[PDB]
């Protein structure tokens, strides 16, 4: 069973360098070329180069010549991809891929799970969770509530409701990158408008990059205007 296990997500600043690893198992590591392919958010696949782990010989796409270095350590069946002088548009998921056959071929049958590399000047920051209050006066026999998970970095954030007891109707939107460099998302759920006064609704937000766990109770806004 061929398997390619890569290193974890990375966070770097412009001008810095990053090195992703790709541990191979289930086959003779030195018998197959190893390729590296990246994918920017919402974009397609981009070939970066390959390395012959048997000889150490490499070949880089012209776009990365002089800025990428591919190495291998046969003693631990690991291939590496080092990209230096990072910039914002280097933010992408980086994959290692192995050909189908034992000779050189472009048929990438085996892939690693991908390594997200975020390039940004922002510092690690936990989210600020705010309620998206429901209202009996805003129904399209259903109310909507949620949590605004704003100003956090880096990806990712996970949101649950009532510690996982509430799942149906939950929509946790993909995060958006704000001009400030910090991410933001919302998590909403549709529920019966009649249960707003009886059922408790709490969103459980987790931002592991900052070891942050936040529980926010969501209820209708308290109006006091006369």
């Amino acid at each position: 069973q061929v398997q390619l296990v890569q290193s974890g997500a990375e966070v770097k600043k412009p001008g810095a360098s990053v090195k992703v690893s790709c541990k191979a198992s289930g086959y003779t590591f030195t018998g197959y070329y190893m390729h590296w392919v990246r994918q920017a958010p919402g974009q397609g696949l981009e070939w970066m180069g390959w390395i012959n782990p048997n000889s150490g010989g490499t070949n880089y796409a012209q776009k990365f010549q002089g800025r990428v270095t591919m190495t291998r350590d046969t003693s631990i069946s690991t291939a590496y991809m080092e990209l230096s002088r990072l910039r914002s548009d280097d933010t992408a998921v980086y994959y290692c891929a192995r050909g189908k056959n034992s000779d050189y071929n472009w048929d990438f049958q085996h892939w690693g799970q991908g390594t997200l590399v975020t390039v940004s000047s922002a510092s690690t920051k936990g989210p600020s969770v705010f309620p998206l209050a429901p209202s009996s006066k805003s129904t399209s026999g259903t109310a909507a509530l949620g949590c605004l998970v704003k100003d956090y970095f880096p990806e990712p954030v996970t949101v649950s409701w009532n510690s996982g007891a509430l799942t149906s109707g939950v929509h946790t939107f993909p995060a958006v990158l704000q001009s400030s460099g910090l991410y933001s998302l919302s998590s909403v759920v549709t529920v019966p408008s009649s249960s707003l006064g009886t059922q408790t609704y709490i969103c459980n937000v987790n931002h592991k990059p900052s070891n942050t766990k936040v529980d926010k109770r969501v209820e209708p806004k308290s109006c006091d205007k006369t």
Binding site: G44, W111, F130, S138, S140, A144, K150, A175, V176, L185
Partner: protein
């Protein structure tokens, strides 16, 4: 250099129908062309190689063909697991992908508007969220109007992946303003136009009200 142009950008088909995906090379060199499948959060999966040979473990409903520059991936009868992004490849070059999504009956969105929380205003910013819930097709128009003034450049949208149960989409539009600007106005409205709505739907609230 070879440029692979895939078309259409998006295919909308129902389970059981046949899908035809096109990939055109800027120039004809060989049949050394592969097709890949990719789902959100996962790595690509090899489907076809040599233009028409099927990779191991791939169901036979996937087939590849080609004639000169024009290559075609055909899925005879779509299964729910087939809706994903598909890429063609020749040498180091990849097509830009064709998204295959589920076509279902038109479903209008449920529209909700959320004012900013008092807690957030205390921090100095106001986030106004408009929610479109479980609609199809994915295309919708969401316009913000503050005191009947069209907003531009101060809002962002986010769309969910197609729901695995009802094959609908949900969309959020977030208007972000400073506390100062948020206090200069009263009426905040979200205008939604969608194919499933006989007329546009408007949700609004007046700042400092009930």
């Amino acid at each position: 250099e070879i440029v692979l142009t895939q078309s259409p950008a998006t295919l909308s088909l129902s389970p059981g129908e046949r899908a035809t995906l096109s990939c055109r090379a800027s120039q004809s060199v060989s049949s050394y062309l592969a097709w890949y499948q990719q789902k959100p959060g996962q790595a690509p999966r090899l489907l076809i190689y040599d233009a028409s040979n099927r990779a191991t473990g791939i169901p036979a409903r996937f087939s590849g063909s080609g004639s000169g520059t024009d290559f075609t991936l055909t899925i005879s009868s779509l299964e729910p697991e087939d809706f994903a992004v598909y890429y063609c490849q020749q040498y180091e070059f990849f097509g830009q992908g064709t998204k295959l999504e589920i076509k279902r009956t038109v479903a209008a969105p449920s529209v909700f508007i959320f004012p900013p929380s008092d807690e957030q205003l205390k921090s100095g910013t106001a986030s106004v969220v408009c929610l479109l819930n479980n609609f199809y097709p994915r295309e919708a128009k969401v316009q913000w109007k503050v005191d009947n003034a069209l907003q531009s450049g101060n809002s962002q949208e986010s769309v969910t992946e197609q729901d695995s149960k009802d094959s609908t989409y949900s969309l959020s539009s977030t208007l972000t303003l400073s506390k100062a600007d948020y206090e200069k106005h009263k009426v905040y409205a979200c205008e939604v136009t969608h194919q499933g709505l006989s007329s546009p739907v408007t949700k609004s609230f007046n700042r400092g009200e009930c």
